[PDB]
């Protein structure tokens, strides 16, 4: 689809078999989701945002469906204020900016 | 134009008579720029993201030229680690997400 930006670009995602709402975020290199349970191994990582760094759980090669489009990539889970879909996955679904 | 998301969506902007590089950020409600001594009145504001909040100065009705496209709106100035063009201005240049 074509998504305008008058409102936050929020979409439904499916991860680990569960539905959630997430923000398409071209300013995020990586995808960061609020605290949740995901199966499989994970390793600790640090990521920095506008206000500092947070500790996240890095899950690699995770299946995630974004607005009906499949992706398999890295998903960071931690105390983010909002579920954000970053460029690592936006590229997989063929997302571009246009004006 | 069309901007793929393999790399950070960095573009040149013109603000207050100065040229800068900034990130086209669909995840930012409002525009946040690196410290710059702009003229005119302003109001204190706190904005939050990953890592917490930072203190910024809110200037209203500021003109920015983004890839030759003009836009006028609120600009937040403070110790941001990156120049971010938010939805308040991206809407004015006709920017959409497409996949
Ligand atoms: C030298 C480099 O500095 P740095 O590493 C951090 O640099 C960056 C800092 C921020 C960004 C942009 C933000 N992206 C981000 O958080 O991405 C994280 C995850 O993916 C990684 O990739 C890049 C960083 C990591 C996001 O797009 C927009 N935000 C809101 C969303 C979170 C929705 C709540 S918001 O900025 O907070 C914000 C809040 C309120 C307003 C007013 O309306 C305007 C902007 C990009 C790079 O310093 C370490 C301390």
From Swiss-Prot, chains A, B:
Region (Dimerization of protease): 1-5, 49-55, 88-99
Segments traversing the membrane: none
Domain Peptidase A2: 20-89
Active site residues of this protein: 25 (for protease activity)
Highest taxon listed in the record's lineage: Viruses
The protein's assembly and partners: Homodimer, whose active site consists of two apposed aspartic acid residues.
Protein name as catalogued: Protease
Protein species of origin: Human immunodeficiency virus type 1 group M subtype B (isolate BRU/LAI) (HIV-1)
Residues of the full protein shown: 501 to 599 of 1447
